Design a protein around this ligand. Structure first.
Ligand code: FAD
Ligand code: FAD
Ligand code: LYS
Lengths: 584, 586
């Protein structure tokens, strides 16, 4: 099922219609739709990737001793996300009997609820104070305002990150008279001082984001579109720099507090009625294999692996039959070869576009200044993944079965991932890094001395030594361990891990775990621009990077889907609800 | 003096010996040394720069209404920095009467002390608590430990940033039995629990840096070289993450607490010992020293700075291989035309970002061939810096008894310098400097906004005179928000009027990409610097400047790497005016 054939060879002067570069979710989706809907013969639609596997920022692994999937990248979806959810669970989404669902993909994918853990037992370690994540509510129940070691404005005393986030969004929304008048019924202040709520639809947000004005006559930002203010800028303005410190640390990875587009950050922070987080039992990269395999069933279909796009020109022998000559580097031989095509789908993030030849007709800055301006419209957020295997789930000593702990320590957030009921070998995702913490972790992960795998139950040295290459560094494992002991306190002994799995998503060609719209850009005009930057060229960009659901597979799918409907003459899939809002 | 001629023209197929690219301090210094010592005729040594001025990261400006120089880049030097000090002040450095000194450069430069201000009156604003910088020392004088809103380890309670830094570096140095035994006399615990001091020379540090071992039994970094540990990694290990938070915030810009090479951070933090040394500047603007070196170079006949001429690439494959090893292709920015220069030596007097912006596919940079060059180019952190000069109609900071110096905060602005009052006009200058600890991204969104602060007349400053600065004004959003932070910083007992003029430079802009550079942990710095001065054995191509110096942040770093390069590969002797006991390493 994950043995989808990959061709690391070359086919000099291959002639095709559509060259898809990026075997990520969006590249795979594009190929699947084109050939499934018979817009093109499989042999005329080809995917190229420089990697030695498909899926890009989806990579599921198994570590000896633990018979279940760890995620180095994407790990879960929301049933709000209708392209990825329908693909996994069949259609229609309304049918709630899973045996009256019609499958869309053949590949076996077993949906399973994402365990969220217990906030009575999940930790919050801020400025050396240890809390249960529930401590703000428990204090509110008892009429109290929880003291913390952040000096908030007095009006915000006792608030939780979530409630204070809600208050900031409510306050800013209601200060726009037009937003108050038109959507005030969807922007609700409850009875309790802490309770705010929203019923704003994706559609309502597309109306609000380009028009929202920041209405605060003493602020340096007064009478500016919220589109034009960084989220850090905006949060400090509303609740002081100590307010921003509290939210940026207490929010964890569920929160994006970088200084990105306030207008885009609003819906990102406050969310479709009755949705939940799920994953796939067979690994979250199963959705990529499933889309890939559906494409590769057609003979002529090919993923060219370990083949890196260098450049592309209109000035080549074959202009009578093919607009574009693409030059590929075949990595196994270090030889270049040519591919001829009439359409190019760059299914790749910002960093991957910047690593392509910047001097060709498409990227040359002396011609396409506007394209380069639009490529630079998104922040490249760093992420890494360190998976750690322990001989027993030491976290269960604190009544923690699953979920995440949050700290202002450089580790920021850990996920208690699961236990092998036969071995008791148990998995932590210790990581992701982010704001500032990239440089803290990068000095340690760049170090040359790798963690030494250690034998465990159902995990022999000769099984483990196959993972030598992908171990975290001793310095990074040592220091993460030191922080986990500090995070969890002295009432639990944490033993040394026996195996690790490390990936850094800042590495080329990814340059980022995820992307974030910059303040000052008309997101609603950039997105359609990137799906076809030049009027008289059949070159398209798709993927998560320039989507409005950054952070998610669903963003990559939606930009591919819109590109398909816009330029490749496809209708909405038969299996996708006509009410799922896509946009323009 | 600052009217040094620049040639924005071209001269196709110019045939020289040494092309120096970058008319910054190291490039100017290289050309000045080469001609003054008569190693080549001035027509055989040319300087090319893409800028419309010389000086690079030195740029001194005058704003209408204020008859004194503001600094967009470098401000100050230390009298222990012997090249930059001797070129400014003349020699010998022992002579304490300036009128008894012997000039080295003909251009006149008035050395003045850099006002450091009064720690009684300068502010520290941390987690919404307002301190005077001397509050820690005041508390200790009464036998007290000053509580703060940072939850230090108990053993560290009541330490100032300066004291806690010395304790950290003392503790780490002294835990190494070799360092203890060999340099314990120069690593000094005073009487008070807060008093740590260092007498380690430049030479002592060069012996210590590669050898020092982190000796803390249950540390994650135990038994590793301190050179292989990030400074944030080390600080946290030593005083907890709350301690790092205190030290990173309360440290000025003086302080470099990014996660760079710990071995290199130690000397940066506690000086190369000459305890009688002080900070000074040039009355005529700190860029004066670039102009003095550049003018000394230009008084030789055939000397030329090619301005607005950008190096694109260079090759060994050209028609003239019989006389000239290298063809350089420049872009003449005025005509948008490419012209060639032929040369046998290339001096890239430019930082990391500048190197990376050159053609990476040529024989020199090609990563498929020169993996070691590329690793080493990437051995320094590009640290962001912005400068915003703000001119007010009076020095509102005098209401708090502040004459000069720096106030420090955890607010995004991080630090402001009170730069001076024009005694005729009362027009008074403030610098906000910011960029470290993620404040880059806070400020970038505001400085990338396109509505600019509008100038406004004041005494001896007419809109006619101010409108020439329209293009260099800060954004309105940035000036508004910095003004809001200065009000929060100083408190509600002083009214801060809106300013009448600003001046913004972003040093992350190309081709600089950084204010200054920082060695990464885990590199053999003592081996990377010699490499960078001549990466390839078969090639007379050399890199000099501040970025790969061991005095990062400083003009003296640029001068020293050029000086070493001149002695190593251009057969120059030590300048007659430079003490032979000024340590330049190997
Ligand atoms: C740590 C982390 C956690 C995440 N968690 C989740 C989550 O829980 N849920 C979720 O839905 N999403 C999550 N995501 C995001 C999700 O993984 C991505 O949004 C999605 O996989 C991106 O797909 P894409 O189509 O944009 O392409 P990418 O995944 O970016 O793939 C692009 C491909 O292009 C290839 N390429 C680049 N340049 C070239 C070239 N010159 N020639 C050939 N090939 C080239 C690369 O090798 C790569 O395979 C997470 C991401 C990370 C990093
Ligand atoms: C905010 C700030 C504060 C500082 N404070 C001090 C201080 O107080 N005291 C002190 O001593 N030092 C200070 N410094 C450091 C000092 O300014 C620098 O270290 C010094 O100027 C570095 O000189 P350099 O030779 O490395 O070249 P740079 O000054 O980096 O100049 C390099 C030159 O190369 C040119 N160039 C690059 N690429 C090309 C190309 N392709 N073609 C043509 N030209 C090119 C650039 O235009 C530039 O003119 C400060 C720096 C900054 C940013
Ligand atoms: N979707 C990601 C989080 C997005 C991160 C954006 N900075 C996850 O669930 O892990």
């Amino acid at each position: 099922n994950k043995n989808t054939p990959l061709n690391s060879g070359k086919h000099p002067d291959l002639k095709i219609e559509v060259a898809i570069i990026g075997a990520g979710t969006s590249g795979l989706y594009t190929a699947y739709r084109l050939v499934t809907d018979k817009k093109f013969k499989a042999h005329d639609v080809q995917i190229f990737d420089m990697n030695n596997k498909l899926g890009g920022r989806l990579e599921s692994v198994i570590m000896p001793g633990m018979n279940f999937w760890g995620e180095l990248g994407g790990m879960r979806y929301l049933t709000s996300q209708q392209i990825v959810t329908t693909l996994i669970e069949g259609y229609p989404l309304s049918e709630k009997d899973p045996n009256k669902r019609t499958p869309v993909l053949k590949d076996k994918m077993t949906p399973v609820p994402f365990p969220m853990g217990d906030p009575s037992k999940l930790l919050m370690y801020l400025r050396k104070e240890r809390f249960k994540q529930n401590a703000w509510n428990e204090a509110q129940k008892k009429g109290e305002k929880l003291p913390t070691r952040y000096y908030l404005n007095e009006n915000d005393l006792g608030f939780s990150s979530d409630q204070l986030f809600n208050k900031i969004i409510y306050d800013v929304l209601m200060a726009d008279p037009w937003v108050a008048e038109t959507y005030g019924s969807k922007i609700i202040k409850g009875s309790s001082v802490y309770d705010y709520s929203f019923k704003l639809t994706s559609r309502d947000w597309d109306d609000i984001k380009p028009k929202l004005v920041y209405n605060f006559p003493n602020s340096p930002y007064d009478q500016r579109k919220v589109n034009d203010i960084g989220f850090w800028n905006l949060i400090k303005d509303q609740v002081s720099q100590e307010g921003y410190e509290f939210l940026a640390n207490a929010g964890g990875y569920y929160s994006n507090t970088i200084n990105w587009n306030s207008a885009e950050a609003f819906p990102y922070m406050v969310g479709s009625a009755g949705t939940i987080y799920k994953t796939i039992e067979e690994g979250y990269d199963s959705i990529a294999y499933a889309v890939a395999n559906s494409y590769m069933e057609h003979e002529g279909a090919c993923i060219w692996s370990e083949n890196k796009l260098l450049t592309f020109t209109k000035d080549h022998p074959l202009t009578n039959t093919h607009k574009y000559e693409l030059t590929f580097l075949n990595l196994k031989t270090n030889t270049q070869w040519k591919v001829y095509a009439n359409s190019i789908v760059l299914a790749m993030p910002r960093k991957s576009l910047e690593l392509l030849d910047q001097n060709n007709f498409f990227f040359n800055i002396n011609k396409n200044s506007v394209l380069n301006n639009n490529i630079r419209s998104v922040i490249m957020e760093p992420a890494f993944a360190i998976l750690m295997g322990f001989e027993y789930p030491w976290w269960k000593e604190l009544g923690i079965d699953s979920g995440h702990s949050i700290t202002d320590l450089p580790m920021r957030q850990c996920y208690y991932f699961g236990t092998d009921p036969e071995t008791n070998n148990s998995m932590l995702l210790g990581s992701y890094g982010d704001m500032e913490t990239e440089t803290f972790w990068k000095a340690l992960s760049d170090d040359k001395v790798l963690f030494e795998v250690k034998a465990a139950k159902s995990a022999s040295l000769r099984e483990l030594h196959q993972l030598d290459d992908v171990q975290a560094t001793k310095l990074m494992v040592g220091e993460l361990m030191n922080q986990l002991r500090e995070l969890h306190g002295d009432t639990v002994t944490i033993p040394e891990p026996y195996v690790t799995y490390f990936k850094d998503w800042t590495d080329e060609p990814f340059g980022a775990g995820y992307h974030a719209w910059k303040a000052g850009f008309s997101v609603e005009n950039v997105m359609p621009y990137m799906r076809k930057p030049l009027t008289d060229e059949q070159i398209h960009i798709c993927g998560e990077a320039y989507s409005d659901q950054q952070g998610w597979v669903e963003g990559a799918f939606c930009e591919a889907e819109k590109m398909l409907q816009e330029y490749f003459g496809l209708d909405r899939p038969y299996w996708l609800s006509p009410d799922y809002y896509l946009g323009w």
